[PDB]
Each structure stands twice: as structure tokens, then as C-alpha cells.
Tab-separated table of C-alpha atoms and ligand atoms in Angstrom:
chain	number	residue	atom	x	y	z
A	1	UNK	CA	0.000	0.000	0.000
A	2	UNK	CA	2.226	2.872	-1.288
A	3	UNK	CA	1.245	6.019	0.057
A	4	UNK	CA	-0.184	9.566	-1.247
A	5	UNK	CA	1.405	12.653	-0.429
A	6	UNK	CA	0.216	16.126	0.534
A	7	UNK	CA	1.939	19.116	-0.926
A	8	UNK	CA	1.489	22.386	0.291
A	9	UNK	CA	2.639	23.944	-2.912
A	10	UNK	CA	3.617	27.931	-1.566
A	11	UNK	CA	4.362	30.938	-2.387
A	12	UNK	CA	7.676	31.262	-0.752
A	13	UNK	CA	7.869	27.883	0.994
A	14	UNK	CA	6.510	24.550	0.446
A	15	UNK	CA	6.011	21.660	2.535
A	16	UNK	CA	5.296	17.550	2.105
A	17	UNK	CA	3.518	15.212	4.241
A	18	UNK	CA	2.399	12.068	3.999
A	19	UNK	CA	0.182	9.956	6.364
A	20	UNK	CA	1.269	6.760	8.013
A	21	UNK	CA	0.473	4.343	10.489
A	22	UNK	CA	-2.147	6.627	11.873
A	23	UNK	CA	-0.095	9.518	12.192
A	24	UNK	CA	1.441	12.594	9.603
A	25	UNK	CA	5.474	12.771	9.057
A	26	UNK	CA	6.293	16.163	7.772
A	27	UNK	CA	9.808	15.674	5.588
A	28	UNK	CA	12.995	17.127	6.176
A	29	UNK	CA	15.088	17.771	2.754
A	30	UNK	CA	18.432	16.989	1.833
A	31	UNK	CA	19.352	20.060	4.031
A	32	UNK	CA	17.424	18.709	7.247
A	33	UNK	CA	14.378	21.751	6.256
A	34	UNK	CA	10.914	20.407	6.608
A	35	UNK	CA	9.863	23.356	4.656
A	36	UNK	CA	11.774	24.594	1.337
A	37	UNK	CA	11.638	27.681	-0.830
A	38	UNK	CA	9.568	27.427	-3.516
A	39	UNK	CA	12.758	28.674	-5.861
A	40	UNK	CA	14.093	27.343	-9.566
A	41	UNK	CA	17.239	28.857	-10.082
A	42	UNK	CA	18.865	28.984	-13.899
A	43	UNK	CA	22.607	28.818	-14.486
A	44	UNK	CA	25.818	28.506	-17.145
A	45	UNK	CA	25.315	25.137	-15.830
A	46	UNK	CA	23.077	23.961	-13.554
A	47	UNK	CA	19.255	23.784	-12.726
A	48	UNK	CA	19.024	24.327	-8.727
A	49	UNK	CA	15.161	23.885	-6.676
A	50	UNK	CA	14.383	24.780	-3.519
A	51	UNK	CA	17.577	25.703	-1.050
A	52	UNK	CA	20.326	25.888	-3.182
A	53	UNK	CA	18.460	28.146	-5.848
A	54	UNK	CA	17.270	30.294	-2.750
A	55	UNK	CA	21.259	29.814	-0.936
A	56	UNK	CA	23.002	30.554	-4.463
A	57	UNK	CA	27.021	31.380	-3.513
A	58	UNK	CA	27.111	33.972	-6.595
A	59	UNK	CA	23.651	36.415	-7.166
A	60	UNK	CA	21.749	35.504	-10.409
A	61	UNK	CA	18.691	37.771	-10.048
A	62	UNK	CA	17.743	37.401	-13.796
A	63	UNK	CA	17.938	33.926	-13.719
A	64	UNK	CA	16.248	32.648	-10.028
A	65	UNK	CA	12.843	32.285	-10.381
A	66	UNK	CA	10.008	32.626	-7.672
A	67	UNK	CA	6.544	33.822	-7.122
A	68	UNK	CA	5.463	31.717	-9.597
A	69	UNK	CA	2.415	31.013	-7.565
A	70	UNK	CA	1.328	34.518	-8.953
A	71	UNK	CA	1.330	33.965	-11.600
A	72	UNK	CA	-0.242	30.840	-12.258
A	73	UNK	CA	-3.352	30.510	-13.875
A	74	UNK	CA	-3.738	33.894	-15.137
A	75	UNK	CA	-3.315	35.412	-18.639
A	76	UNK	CA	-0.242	37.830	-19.385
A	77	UNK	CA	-2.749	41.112	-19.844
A	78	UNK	CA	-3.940	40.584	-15.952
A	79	UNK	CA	-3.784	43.354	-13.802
A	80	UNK	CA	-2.181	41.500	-11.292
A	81	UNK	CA	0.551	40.017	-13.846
A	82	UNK	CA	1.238	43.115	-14.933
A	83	UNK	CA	0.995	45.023	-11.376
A	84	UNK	CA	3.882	41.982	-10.197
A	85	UNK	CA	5.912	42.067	-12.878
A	86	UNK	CA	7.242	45.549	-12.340
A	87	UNK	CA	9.174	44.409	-9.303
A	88	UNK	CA	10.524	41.160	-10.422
A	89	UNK	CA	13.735	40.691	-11.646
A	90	UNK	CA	13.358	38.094	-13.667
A	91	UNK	CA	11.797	38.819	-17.168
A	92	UNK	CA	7.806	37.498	-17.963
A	93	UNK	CA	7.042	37.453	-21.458
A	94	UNK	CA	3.587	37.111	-23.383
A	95	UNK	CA	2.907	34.077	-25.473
A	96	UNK	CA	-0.521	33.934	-26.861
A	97	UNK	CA	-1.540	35.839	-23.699
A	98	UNK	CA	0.081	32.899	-21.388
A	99	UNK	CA	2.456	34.683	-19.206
A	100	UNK	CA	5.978	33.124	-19.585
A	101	UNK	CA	9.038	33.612	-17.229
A	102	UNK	CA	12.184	33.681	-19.543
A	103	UNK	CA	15.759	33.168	-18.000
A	104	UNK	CA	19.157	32.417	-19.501
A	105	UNK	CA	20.112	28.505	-19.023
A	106	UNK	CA	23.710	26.994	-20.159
A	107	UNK	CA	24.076	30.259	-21.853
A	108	UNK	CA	20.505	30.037	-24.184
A	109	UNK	CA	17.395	32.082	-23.570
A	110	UNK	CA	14.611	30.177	-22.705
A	111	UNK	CA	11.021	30.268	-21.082
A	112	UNK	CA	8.869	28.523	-18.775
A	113	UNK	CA	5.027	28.365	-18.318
A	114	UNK	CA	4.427	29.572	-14.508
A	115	UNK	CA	2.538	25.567	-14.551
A	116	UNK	CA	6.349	24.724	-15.713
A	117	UNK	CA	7.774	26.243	-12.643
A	118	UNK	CA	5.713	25.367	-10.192
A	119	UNK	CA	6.137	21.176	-11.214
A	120	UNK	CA	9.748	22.142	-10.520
A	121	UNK	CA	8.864	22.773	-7.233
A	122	UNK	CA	6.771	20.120	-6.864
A	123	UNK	CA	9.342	17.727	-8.128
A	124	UNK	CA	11.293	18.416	-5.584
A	125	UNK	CA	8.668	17.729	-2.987
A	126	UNK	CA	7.847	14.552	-4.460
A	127	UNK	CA	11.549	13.553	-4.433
A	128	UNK	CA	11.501	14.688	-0.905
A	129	UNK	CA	8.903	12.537	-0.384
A	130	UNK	CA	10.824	9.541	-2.270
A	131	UNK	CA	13.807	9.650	-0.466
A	132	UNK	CA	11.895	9.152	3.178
A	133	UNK	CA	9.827	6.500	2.213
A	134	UNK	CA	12.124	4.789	-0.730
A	135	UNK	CA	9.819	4.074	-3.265
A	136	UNK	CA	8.381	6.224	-6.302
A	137	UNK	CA	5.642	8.127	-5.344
A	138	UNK	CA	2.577	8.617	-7.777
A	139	UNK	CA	-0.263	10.038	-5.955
A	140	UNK	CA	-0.731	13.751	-4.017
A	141	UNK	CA	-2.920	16.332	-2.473
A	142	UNK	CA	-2.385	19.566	-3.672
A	143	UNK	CA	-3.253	22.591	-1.869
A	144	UNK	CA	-4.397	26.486	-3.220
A	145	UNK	CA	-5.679	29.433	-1.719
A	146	UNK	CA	-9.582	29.631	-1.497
A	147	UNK	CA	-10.056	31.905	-3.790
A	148	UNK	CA	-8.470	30.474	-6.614
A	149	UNK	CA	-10.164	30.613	-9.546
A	150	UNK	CA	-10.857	27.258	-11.834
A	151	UNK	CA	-8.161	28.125	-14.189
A	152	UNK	CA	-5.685	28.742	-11.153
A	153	UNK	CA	-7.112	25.422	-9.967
A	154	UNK	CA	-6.914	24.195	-13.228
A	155	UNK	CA	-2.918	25.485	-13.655
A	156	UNK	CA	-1.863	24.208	-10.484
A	157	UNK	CA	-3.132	20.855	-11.416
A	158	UNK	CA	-1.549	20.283	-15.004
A	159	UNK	CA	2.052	21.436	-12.571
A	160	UNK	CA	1.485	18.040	-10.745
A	161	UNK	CA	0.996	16.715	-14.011
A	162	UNK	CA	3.624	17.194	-15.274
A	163	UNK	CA	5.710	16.142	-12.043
A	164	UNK	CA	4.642	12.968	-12.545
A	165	UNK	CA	1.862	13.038	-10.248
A	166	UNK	CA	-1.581	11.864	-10.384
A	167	UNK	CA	-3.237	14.611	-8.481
A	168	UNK	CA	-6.239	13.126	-5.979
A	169	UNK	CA	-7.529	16.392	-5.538
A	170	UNK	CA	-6.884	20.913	-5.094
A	171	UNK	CA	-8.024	21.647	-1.795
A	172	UNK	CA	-8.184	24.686	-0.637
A	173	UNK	CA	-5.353	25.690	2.142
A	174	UNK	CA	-7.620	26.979	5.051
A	175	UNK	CA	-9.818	23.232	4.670
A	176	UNK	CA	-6.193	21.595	4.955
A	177	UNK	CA	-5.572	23.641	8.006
A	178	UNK	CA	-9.055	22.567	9.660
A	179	UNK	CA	-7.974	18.886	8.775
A	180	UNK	CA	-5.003	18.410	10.219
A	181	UNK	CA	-6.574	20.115	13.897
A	182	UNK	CA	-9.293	17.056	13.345
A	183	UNK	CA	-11.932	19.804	12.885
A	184	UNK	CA	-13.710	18.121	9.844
A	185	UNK	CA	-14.019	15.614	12.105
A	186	UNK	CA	-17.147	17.487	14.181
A	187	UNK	CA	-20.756	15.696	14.031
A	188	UNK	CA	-24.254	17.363	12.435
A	189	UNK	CA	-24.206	21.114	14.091
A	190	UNK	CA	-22.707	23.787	12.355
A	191	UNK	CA	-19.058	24.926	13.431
A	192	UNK	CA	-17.570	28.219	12.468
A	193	UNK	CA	-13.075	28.055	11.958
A	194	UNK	CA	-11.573	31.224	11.579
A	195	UNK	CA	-8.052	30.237	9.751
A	196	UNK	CA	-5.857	33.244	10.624
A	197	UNK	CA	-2.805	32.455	8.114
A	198	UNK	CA	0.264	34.550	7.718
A	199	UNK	CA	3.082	33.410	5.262
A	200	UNK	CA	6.119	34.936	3.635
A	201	UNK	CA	4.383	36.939	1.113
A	202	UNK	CA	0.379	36.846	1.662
A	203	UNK	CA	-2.194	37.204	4.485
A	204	UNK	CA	-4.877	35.194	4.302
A	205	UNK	CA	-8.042	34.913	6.791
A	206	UNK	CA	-11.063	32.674	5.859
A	207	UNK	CA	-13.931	31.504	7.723
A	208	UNK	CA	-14.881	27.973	7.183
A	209	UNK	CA	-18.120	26.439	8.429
A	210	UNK	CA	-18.201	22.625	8.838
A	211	UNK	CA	-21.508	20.403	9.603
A	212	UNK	CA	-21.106	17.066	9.732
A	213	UNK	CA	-17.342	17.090	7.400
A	214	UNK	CA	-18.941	18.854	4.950
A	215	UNK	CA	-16.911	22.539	4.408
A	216	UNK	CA	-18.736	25.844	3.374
A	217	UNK	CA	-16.106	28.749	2.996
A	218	UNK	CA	-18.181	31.387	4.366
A	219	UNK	CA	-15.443	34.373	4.039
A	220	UNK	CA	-12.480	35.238	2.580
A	221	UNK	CA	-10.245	38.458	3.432
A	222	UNK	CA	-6.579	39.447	3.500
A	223	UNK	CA	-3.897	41.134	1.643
A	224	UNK	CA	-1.806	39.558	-1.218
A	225	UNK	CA	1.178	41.762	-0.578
A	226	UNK	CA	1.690	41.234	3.542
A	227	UNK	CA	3.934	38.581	4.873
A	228	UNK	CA	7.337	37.555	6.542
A	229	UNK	CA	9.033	39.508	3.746
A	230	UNK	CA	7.490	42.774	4.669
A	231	UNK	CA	8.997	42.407	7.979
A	232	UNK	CA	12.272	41.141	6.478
A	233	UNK	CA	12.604	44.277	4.418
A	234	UNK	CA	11.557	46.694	7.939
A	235	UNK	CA	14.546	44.952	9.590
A	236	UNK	CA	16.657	45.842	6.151
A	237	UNK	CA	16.343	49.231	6.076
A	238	UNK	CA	16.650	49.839	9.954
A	239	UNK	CA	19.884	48.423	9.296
A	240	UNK	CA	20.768	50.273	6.123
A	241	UNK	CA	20.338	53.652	8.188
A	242	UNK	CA	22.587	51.623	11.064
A	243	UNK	CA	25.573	51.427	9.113
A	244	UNK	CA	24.835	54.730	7.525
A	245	UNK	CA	25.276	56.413	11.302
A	246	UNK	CA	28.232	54.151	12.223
A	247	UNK	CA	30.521	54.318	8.628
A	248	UNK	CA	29.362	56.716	6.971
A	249	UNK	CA	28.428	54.732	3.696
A	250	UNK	CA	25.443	53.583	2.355
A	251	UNK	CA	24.975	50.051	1.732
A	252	UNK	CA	21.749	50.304	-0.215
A	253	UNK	CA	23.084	50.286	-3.847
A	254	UNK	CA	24.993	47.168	-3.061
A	255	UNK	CA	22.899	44.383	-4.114
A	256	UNK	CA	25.144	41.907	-2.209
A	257	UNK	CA	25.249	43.127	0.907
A	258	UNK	CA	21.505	43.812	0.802
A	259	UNK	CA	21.144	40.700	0.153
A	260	UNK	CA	23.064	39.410	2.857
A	261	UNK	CA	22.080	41.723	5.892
A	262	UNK	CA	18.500	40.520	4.455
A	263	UNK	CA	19.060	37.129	4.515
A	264	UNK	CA	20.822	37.805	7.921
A	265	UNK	CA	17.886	39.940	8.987
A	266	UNK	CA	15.406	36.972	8.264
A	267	UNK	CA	17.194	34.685	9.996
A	268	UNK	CA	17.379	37.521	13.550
A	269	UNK	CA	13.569	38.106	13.042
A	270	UNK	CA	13.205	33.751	13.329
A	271	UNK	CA	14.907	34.555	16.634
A	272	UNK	CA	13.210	36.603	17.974
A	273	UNK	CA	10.011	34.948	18.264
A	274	UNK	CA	11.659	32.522	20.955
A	275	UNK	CA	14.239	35.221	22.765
A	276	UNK	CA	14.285	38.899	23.220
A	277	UNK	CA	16.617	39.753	21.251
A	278	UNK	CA	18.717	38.691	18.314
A	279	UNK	CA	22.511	38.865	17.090
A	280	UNK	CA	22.978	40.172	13.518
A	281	UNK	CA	26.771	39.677	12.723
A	282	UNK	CA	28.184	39.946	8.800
A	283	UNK	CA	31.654	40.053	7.767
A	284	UNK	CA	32.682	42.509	5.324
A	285	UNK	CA	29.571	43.803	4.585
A	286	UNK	CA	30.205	46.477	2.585
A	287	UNK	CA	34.235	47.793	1.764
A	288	UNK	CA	35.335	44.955	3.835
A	289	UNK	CA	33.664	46.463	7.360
A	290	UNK	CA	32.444	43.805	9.485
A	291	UNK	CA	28.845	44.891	10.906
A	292	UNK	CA	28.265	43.745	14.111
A	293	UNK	CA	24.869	44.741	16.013
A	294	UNK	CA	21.977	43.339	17.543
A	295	UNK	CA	18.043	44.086	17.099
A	296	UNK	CA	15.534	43.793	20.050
A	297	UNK	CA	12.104	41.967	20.023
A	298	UNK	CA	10.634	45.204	20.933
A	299	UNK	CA	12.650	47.275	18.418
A	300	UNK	CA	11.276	44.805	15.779
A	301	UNK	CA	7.656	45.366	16.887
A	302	UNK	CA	8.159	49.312	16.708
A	303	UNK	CA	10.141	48.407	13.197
A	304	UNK	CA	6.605	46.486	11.940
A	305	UNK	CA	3.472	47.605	14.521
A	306	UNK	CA	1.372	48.878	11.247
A	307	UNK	CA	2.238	46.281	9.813
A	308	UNK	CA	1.263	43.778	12.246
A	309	UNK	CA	-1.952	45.986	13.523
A	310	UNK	CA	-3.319	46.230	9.489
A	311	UNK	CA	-4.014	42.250	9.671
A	312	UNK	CA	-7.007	42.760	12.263
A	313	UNK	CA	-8.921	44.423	9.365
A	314	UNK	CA	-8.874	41.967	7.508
A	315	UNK	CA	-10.208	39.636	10.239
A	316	UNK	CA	-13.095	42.385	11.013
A	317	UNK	CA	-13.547	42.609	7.196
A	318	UNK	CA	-13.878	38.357	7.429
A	319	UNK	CA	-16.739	38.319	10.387
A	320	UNK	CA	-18.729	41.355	8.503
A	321	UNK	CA	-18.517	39.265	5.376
A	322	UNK	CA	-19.296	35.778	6.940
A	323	UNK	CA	-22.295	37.307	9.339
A	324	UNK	CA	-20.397	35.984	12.680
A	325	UNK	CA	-19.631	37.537	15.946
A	326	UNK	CA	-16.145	37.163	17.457
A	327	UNK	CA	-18.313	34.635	19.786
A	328	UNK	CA	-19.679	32.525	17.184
A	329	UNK	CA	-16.319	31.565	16.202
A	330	UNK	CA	-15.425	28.291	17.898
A	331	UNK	CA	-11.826	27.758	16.807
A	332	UNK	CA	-8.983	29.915	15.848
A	333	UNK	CA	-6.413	28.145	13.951
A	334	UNK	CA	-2.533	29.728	12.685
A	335	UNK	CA	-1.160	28.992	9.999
A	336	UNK	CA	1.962	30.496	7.978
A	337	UNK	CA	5.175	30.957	9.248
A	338	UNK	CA	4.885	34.055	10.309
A	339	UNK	CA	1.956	33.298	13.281
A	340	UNK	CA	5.322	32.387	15.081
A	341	UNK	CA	5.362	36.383	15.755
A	342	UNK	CA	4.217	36.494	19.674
A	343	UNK	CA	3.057	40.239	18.859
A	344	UNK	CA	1.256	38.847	16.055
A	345	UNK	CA	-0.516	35.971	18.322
A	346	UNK	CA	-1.200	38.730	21.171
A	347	UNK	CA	-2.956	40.844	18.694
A	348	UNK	CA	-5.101	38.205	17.472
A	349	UNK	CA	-5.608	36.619	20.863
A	350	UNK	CA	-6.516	39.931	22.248
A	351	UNK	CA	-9.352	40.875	19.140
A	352	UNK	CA	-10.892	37.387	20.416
A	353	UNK	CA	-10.601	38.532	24.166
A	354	UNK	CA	-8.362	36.152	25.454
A	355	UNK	CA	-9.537	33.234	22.750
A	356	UNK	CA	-7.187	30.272	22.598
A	357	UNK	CA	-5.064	29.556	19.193
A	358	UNK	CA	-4.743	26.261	18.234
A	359	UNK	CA	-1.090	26.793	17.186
A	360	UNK	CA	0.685	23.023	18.134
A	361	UNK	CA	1.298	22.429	14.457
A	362	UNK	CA	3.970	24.016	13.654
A	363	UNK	CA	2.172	26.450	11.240
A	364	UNK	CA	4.485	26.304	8.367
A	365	UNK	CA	3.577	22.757	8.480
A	366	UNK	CA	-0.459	22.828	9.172
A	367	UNK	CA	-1.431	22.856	5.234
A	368	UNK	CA	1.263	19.867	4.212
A	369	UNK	CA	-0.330	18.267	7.296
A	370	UNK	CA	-3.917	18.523	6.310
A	371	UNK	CA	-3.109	17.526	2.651
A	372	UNK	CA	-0.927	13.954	4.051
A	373	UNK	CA	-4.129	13.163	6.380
A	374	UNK	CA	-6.618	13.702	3.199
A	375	UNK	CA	-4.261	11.691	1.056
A	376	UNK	CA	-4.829	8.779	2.334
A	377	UNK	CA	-8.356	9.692	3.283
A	378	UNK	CA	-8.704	9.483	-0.275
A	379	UNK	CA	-6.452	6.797	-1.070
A	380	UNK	CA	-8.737	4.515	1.073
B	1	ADP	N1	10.015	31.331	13.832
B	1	ADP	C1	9.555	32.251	12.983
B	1	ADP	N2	9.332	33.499	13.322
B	1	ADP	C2	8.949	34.427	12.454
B	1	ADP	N3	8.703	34.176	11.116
B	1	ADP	C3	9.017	32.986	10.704
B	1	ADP	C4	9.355	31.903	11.613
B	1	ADP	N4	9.523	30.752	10.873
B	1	ADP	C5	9.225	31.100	9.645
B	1	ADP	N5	8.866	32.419	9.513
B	1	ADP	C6	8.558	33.104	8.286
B	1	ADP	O1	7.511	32.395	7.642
B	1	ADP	C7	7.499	32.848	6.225
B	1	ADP	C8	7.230	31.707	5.384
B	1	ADP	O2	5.886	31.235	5.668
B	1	ADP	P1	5.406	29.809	5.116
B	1	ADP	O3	4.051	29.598	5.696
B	1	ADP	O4	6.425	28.770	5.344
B	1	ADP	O5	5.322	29.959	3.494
B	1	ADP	P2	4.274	30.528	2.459
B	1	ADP	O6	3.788	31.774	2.900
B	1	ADP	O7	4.885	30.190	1.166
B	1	ADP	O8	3.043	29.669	2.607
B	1	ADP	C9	8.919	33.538	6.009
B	1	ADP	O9	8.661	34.938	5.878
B	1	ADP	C10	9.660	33.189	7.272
B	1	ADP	O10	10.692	34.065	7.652
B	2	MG	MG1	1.183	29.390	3.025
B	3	NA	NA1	3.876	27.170	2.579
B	4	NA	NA1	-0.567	32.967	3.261
């Protein structure tokens, strides 16, 4: 009985499960990561997924590809296509109003349907997946936001297509959460789930009602352009205007040692959810100066309060829409990496006066989780 995975296929990160012996593993890569970047990287020689097109030793902007998950499913004259592709650096192209992400590979322009892309990704997860349980894997879950459309649906799909996977079934990413906290599980009775899920790069809040297993989404709200690397870039330019006051120079044309103190600014921010503070130490950053410092949990909160305050709205914006009373919601469930903020948890906690979160999945994890339990739900 060879098992069916669940993929949560995401933005920035993605994350495989699969379901045995009554119970979900979540997989740890090559690199020990039970999440990884949801990154295809093009070079003179070499096609790198996941951590080592995210990790690359040398900066290839032009040719590391991400955000695919934007977009996927939607023709090249879109707003939204258009609206992202300003701030890419990679190039998107238009074929026969199909967007198309074009890079330079062993020294050859080429281009990839965002469907393309995304199978890269999910290649990887599946090989994940492969390498833990040591067979070939040939069935998955796949998981989308809620309000994907059918031809986002549709997109995502054909990507697990062509990785080699027959796909069981899209489901949508709040349902997933729900799953994996047993909440499908409830009996005839209606029971409202407010899914409160903050990634890298998008908030998302839905409302789900569930009678009996069966899954109504009620509400959706949020903000495509609010995550972890919002916060990430606060932290950047706090530390930007740092070395500015101590050297006199300014770092911010350098696109190396942005990225660096960003990638070191990432990893200080991860900190400081579990301590109070956070050591942010890069050698020769910039004309071979060291910079040496160290960022507070409550500097951080100051760095990112509008930030963090703006995702109440769209939780207000959620119960208007759905009809429901803070009260009428029985369970609050985190998801996305970035519900690991405590300020984050206290101002959600606080809107629902004192409300428990159901946060014991670690809630980069929570959608993978969900998908691995309705694998093999589905699987029978
Ligand atoms: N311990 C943590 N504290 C704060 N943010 C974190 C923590 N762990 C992960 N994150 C952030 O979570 C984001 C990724 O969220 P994730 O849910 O894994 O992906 P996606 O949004 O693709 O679904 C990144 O911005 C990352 O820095
Ligand atoms: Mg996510
Ligand atoms: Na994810
Ligand atoms: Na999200």
C-alpha cells in the first residue's frame, strides 16, 4: 500500500507530508528543512530547486525564479501580472496571452510556463517525499488558496501533471488547516473556523463552516502583498540607516550586501520569536567592514506595529462578510510561518478577548499536514 502525499505547494515555501500508520510525518530535505523555498534557479550550468536556488554562492537575479504562484493561472494582460511584474527581476514574457518567465540557461534564452515552474517545485517535494519513504511516489494532495479561480485550480493541477503526479484532488489551504486540527471531524451542528494564516508573502483569513465534514467557505479576506518579507525588508532598512550612522556609507546600492544583511535579517527576526533579542553579525559587509549589532524583540515590533496591527482588518472585514460575531467563532487556527510572531498571536488573541489559538502544528507545516491526512483519506 504505497502512500499519497500532501503538498502544500507555496508561495515562498513549500512543505510535504504524507500519512502513516495513523499519524502525519512532515519531511525534512536533503538540508534537514521540513519546509523549502519554492525557488528554480537557472545557471551557465546547472538547474538548482528549492535551497540551493534560494542559498546561491554567486547572485543571479535574472535567472532565479520565484513567485510563480502569482502567476499561475492567469493570462499575461492581468492586472495583477502586470501590477507583479514591475518588481521582479526576472523577465515574464507574453505568449498567446500565457504569461511566460524567460531566463538564460547553459548560456541560451529560454522560457517557462508559470505551470512549468511550479512542477519544478513540486518535483522536488515529491523527491523529498521519495527519499523518506524509498519508493516512487505517484499520488498527491495539492493545496491552493480559497479563492483560486478554476483556471488557477486548473494550472496548479496540469504542474502536478507534469511532475509525474496523479493529483487526488486541489483543496483549498484553510480546509487543509481545519484537517489536520481534526476539525472536519465534528458531528451534524454547524461549526464556524476562523483560519488566521500569515506566510512569507500573503495574508490570508477565511472563515470555514463545517456540519457534519462537509466545508462551506463562508469568508475570505486578507492582503496579497503582507507577509514575513514585509517584515524582512523593515529589519533591512533599519539596518541600512545603522551602518549609515556608524561608517558613513550607504549600503543600499549594493545588491550583495543587501542581500546578505536581508538574509541575515530573516534569519534575527526567526529569533526573535523565541528570545528577546537577536545577534545580527556579517563580515565585510560592505568595503570589507564587518557589521556587528543586535536588534531587540521590541525594536522589531516598533520596526513592523502597522504592519502587524493592518491584519485585524482583515479579520473584522472576514466576520462582517461571513455574518459571525467574534463569539460565534469556535476555533482559531494559525497557519503560515509568520503566526510564530508572539506580537502577532497577542494581537489576534486579544481581538478574540483572550480566545485560545490552536497553534501546536507548527504552522508552516499545518497545510502539508492537512493535505498527508486527506491523502490517504482518499487513497482509502
Ligand atoms: N520562527 C519564525 N518566526 C517568524 N517568522 C518565521 C518563523 N519561521 C518562519 N517564519 C517566516 O515564515 C514565512 C514563510 O511562511 P510559510 O508559511 O512557510 O510559506 P508561504 O507563505 O509560502 O506559505 C517567512 O517569511 C519566514 O521568515
Ligand atoms: Mg502558506
Ligand atoms: Na507554505
Ligand atoms: Na498565506
Amino acid at each position: 500500500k504505497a502512500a499519497a502525499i500532501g503538498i502544500d505547494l507555496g508561495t515562498t515555501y513549500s512543505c510535504v507530508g504524507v500519512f502513516q500508520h495513523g499519524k502525519v510525518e512532515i519531511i525534512a530535505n536533503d538540508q534537514g528543512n521540513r519546509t523549502t523555498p519554492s525557488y528554480v534557479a537557472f545557471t551557465d550550468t546547472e538547474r538548482l530547486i528549492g535551497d540551493a536556488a534560494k542559498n546561491q554562492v554567486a547572485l543571479n537575479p535574472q535567472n532565479t525564479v520565484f513567485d510563480a504562484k502569482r502567476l499561475i493561472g492567469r493570462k499575461f494582460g492581468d492586472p495583477v501580472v502586470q501590477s507583479d511584474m514591475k518588481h521582479w527581476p526576472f523577465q515574464v514574457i507574453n505568449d498567446g496571452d500565457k504569461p511566460k518567465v524567460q531566463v538564460s540557461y547553459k548560456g541560451e534564452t529560454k522560457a517557462f510556463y508559470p505551470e512549468e515552474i511550479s512542477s519544478m517545485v513540486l518535483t522536488k517535494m515529491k523527491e523529498i517525499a521519495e527519499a523518506y519513504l524509498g519508493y516512487p511516489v505517484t499520488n498527491a494532495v495539492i493545496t491552493v488558496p480559497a479563492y483560486f479561480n478554476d483556471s488557477q485550480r486548473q494550472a496548479t493541477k496540469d504542474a502536478g501533471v507534469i511532475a509525474g503526479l496523479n493529483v487526488l484532488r486541489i483543496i483549498n489551504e484553510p480546509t487543509a488547516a481545519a484537517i489536520a486540527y481534526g476539525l472536519d471531524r465534528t458531528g451534524k451542528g454547524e461549526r464556524n473556523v476562523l483560519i488566521f494564516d500569515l506566510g512569507g508573502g500573503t495574508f490570508d483569513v477565511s472563515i470555514l463552516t463545517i456540519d457534519d465534514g462537509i466545508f462551506e467557505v463562508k469568508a475570505t479576506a486578507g492582503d496579497t502583498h503582507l507577509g514575513g518579507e514585509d517584515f524582512d525588508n523593515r529589519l533591512v532598512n533599519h539596518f541600512v540607516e545603522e551602518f549609515k550612522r556608524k561608517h558613513k556609507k550607504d549600503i543600499s546600492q549594493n545588491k550583495r550586501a543587501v542581500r546578505r544583511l536581508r538574509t541575515a535579517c530573516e534569519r534575527a527576526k526567526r529569533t526573535l520569536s523565541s528570545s528577546t533579542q537577536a545577534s545580527l553579525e556579517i563580515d565585510s559587509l560592505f568595503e570589507g567592514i564587518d557589521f556587528y549589532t543586535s536588534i531587540t524583540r521590541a525594536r522589531f515590533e516598533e520596526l513592523c506595529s502597522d504592519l502587524f496591527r493592518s491584519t485585524l482588518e482583515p479579520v473584522e472585514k472576514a466576520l462582517r462578510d461571513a455574518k459571525l460575531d467574534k463569539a460565534q467563532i469556535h476555533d482559531l487556527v494559525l497557519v503560515g510561518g509568520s503566526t510564530r510572531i508572539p506580537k502577532v498571536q497577542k494581537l489576534l488573541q486579544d481581538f478574540f478577548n483572550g480566545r485560545d489559538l490552536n497553534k501546536s502544528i507548527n504552522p508552516d507545516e499545518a497545510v502539508a499536514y492537512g493535505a498527508a491526512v486527506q491523502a490517504a483519506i482518499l487513497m482509502g
